[PDB]
């Protein structure tokens, strides 16, 4: 569920 | 809301105008290359003898043609070299390349400028040199890479880098994974651009602000997986890229514990979910796969891009626990007679400089007496927008005292040889040189080094 | 059964195992490029001001894609730069290349090692330098080329060479063709190998014994012709090749007269049908087309290969005859307190060396007092089979006294800065340095220089 930048 | 990393978010590489995003390769998944340990030519308790040969060959990286590559004792990168504290070490350096090169022991406190193996230690094609030295420094992960001036960036791009592991008695007494290739592995983080026929072309990709390609390469492997056969795994991260910053985390934010930095164990273990490394930085971490089960594949990312898959196999439970203290960092006392040294990194692109000047091989820029610790205030003067400059000093392991007058980052309380300095920031280092001679300090975005953002310091016996 | 050339036939380049024969290109015939005269930014009688900019561009050499090339004040080679004995000369050096470079005034008696523009005079991308000097030497043809160490061979290959003309009162008084581009032209002799898309690729063609391609290139032109509009023509030959020797003759063995060499006019005119030149040698010749009529063509060859076609148009008959003596060679007296210096060139391929050593940038190999002429005995110690090594000394114009105890060649009684030394041969030179500092001597097969066959000499005021 989590994406970076 | 917040970045998950310690560095200043606006300065991240991904804001540069010419930023090259990583792209996932379609190349098939394959086992992570673990470079074999280099077999000594001869070893006793007191003496070890090695031959390190720079060579050209070919490596199957993508399907189709093999990539033309350089390596140490192998076609690409290098066999891992083990040194021991207090052991008299003998190395024959052999160059079988068509170009002159240099053998720089990054982070090794050996004499300069010859043994150190920077600009002033050329080895011509077909020739050999003999060096020897005894390391008196803590156990850590160092590395070897080419350092002709100019031409460092290009030679590293061809593939001339190798991990160096330094052992000591203290580290051997700690409860750490240490079975090399099984639960203790190098993770050499690089990128490349592949052109026609899977070849590299540094000059086509040249950028004075730093070369980066879209394909991640881990220990000279594309789309690597690692078979985990133990509950805990030690990873020796090395940023071996020309410019790129790595922002490392697992897909599901699996925690990991940093136990070592560039120059030593950290005094205490530091828990992380996300860790950023600038060029030449090393970080040693333990990952615990205890919540996973046979058949699971857990992936390490940089940002949104997958890098390295860990295929989980059956493993025996592991109850062991790290001590609260890993290592006693004994800070030297500053010599009170010595002033504060101010070093200023200036400019970007072609205009990069240190203290108003571009490097000159005949010119000494600074002096410092051996055995005497001095405060170095290092400033990245670039206004907004700017970049994080990794500042490296040859011939010392330094300590980090402060960042803009505040605490160092949590993983910066051990010995380091490279530190990322944010735009506008002044960092205070405690720097002592043990051995006399000539040493370089510079930015370790390698194109900046080649572009002349370097100076040299003469250390002397008083 | 006699060769027509002065050098030792067995040692000619064409006997090497990796010899690359020239081949006539299929490219269209076209007018010989005559590089324009570089316009001073400002000139008075006492001072001249110039801007010399190293730049990267593209040149249409073959049909289709343009070749990526480097040049001075142009895409390839350079604009011809005119200096005058006695005139204070100001040059701004500007580097707009992506790599650092050096601005070497080959044969110009200027201070070293900075103005000289050798290994110790880097100019980084984007920076400028200011030099000034006053030439106090005879009129002659010199040249400018890149000289970073290493990387000279590669930068010359990219196209960083330009002709430099030095004027004086004595030469102006002589009845010589001097209308630049009409009856007085550079003939810059080089070779290249074209790859995919008409590009050059030094690294693919690299050979430590000397790089040579099959395609002759004359002033940056493939398959050139020149329209002759005068009875007599002055050709200023420069061997700007990495290795290749030129063995020059016209179709029908049409005579020509050499009037000049590297460093001065010849004392007396010398008549030739066949002239051999090694790397960096220059030779100024007068060709008389008096016997030909409009519509005739005369081809200049090297060996059996056509280089340059001279197309005879209508011409006024000539107002010239050469004096029996062109120039007074004022030979200095050897300082009798000084020993004979012996310099030995050794090895081939990767093993090239001078006096048992490869070059080191911070090492001084020799010393000599300024203002004092010394005998240098220079030996090529290559057994047969060997090669002719062109030996070059920075910062001086020397005199050739003898070859194996015999007379120098007919065209070697003037001042020279480069001399071809045959296998096993000792040449005796008379060498004086006017200016203090640091100078180099080396083989001018450019791969040999980059491979470390060079040493440095420090000159001092006593
Ligand atoms: Cu942002
Ligand atoms: Cu020993
Ligand atoms: Cu030894
Ligand atoms: Cu390094
Ligand atoms: Cu280093
Ligand atoms: Cu290369
Ligand atoms: Cu995350
Ligand atoms: Cu299994
Ligand atoms: Cu300060
Ligand atoms: Cu930037
Ligand atoms: Cu930098
Ligand atoms: Cu360095
Ligand atoms: Cu023959
Ligand atoms: Cu003046
Ligand atoms: Cu000036
Ligand atoms: Cu030259
Ligand atoms: Cu020269
Ligand atoms: Cu090709
Ligand atoms: Cu003939
Ligand atoms: Cu006509
Ligand atoms: Cu040879
Ligand atoms: Cu002798
Ligand atoms: Cu030279
Ligand atoms: Cu040579």
TrEMBL record, chains B, C:
<keyword id="KW-0479">Metal-binding</keyword>
<dbReference type="InterPro" id="IPR011707">
    <property type="entry name" value="Cu-oxidase-like_N"/>
</dbReference>
<feature type="domain" description="Plastocyanin-like">
    <location>
        <begin position="57"/>
        <end position="169"/>
    </location>
</feature>
<protein>
    <submittedName>
        <fullName>Multicopper oxidase domain-containing protein</fullName>
    </submittedName>
</protein>
<dbReference type="GO" id="GO:0005507">
    <property type="term" value="F:copper ion binding"/>
</dbReference>
<dbReference type="InterPro" id="IPR045087">
    <property type="entry name" value="Cu-oxidase_fam"/>
</dbReference>
<dbReference type="Pfam" id="PF07731">
    <property type="entry name" value="Cu-oxidase_2"/>
</dbReference>
<dbReference type="Pfam" id="PF07732">
    <property type="entry name" value="Cu-oxidase_3"/>
</dbReference>
<feature type="domain" description="Plastocyanin-like">
    <location>
        <begin position="335"/>
        <end position="458"/>
    </location>
</feature>
<dbReference type="InterPro" id="IPR002355">
    <property type="entry name" value="Cu_oxidase_Cu_BS"/>
</dbReference>
<keyword id="KW-0560">Oxidoreductase</keyword>
<dbReference type="InterPro" id="IPR008972">
    <property type="entry name" value="Cupredoxin"/>
</dbReference>
<dbReference type="InterPro" id="IPR011706">
    <property type="entry name" value="Cu-oxidase_C"/>
</dbReference>
<comment type="similarity">
    <text>Belongs to the multicopper oxidase family.</text>
</comment>
<dbReference type="GO" id="GO:0016491">
    <property type="term" value="F:oxidoreductase activity"/>
</dbReference>
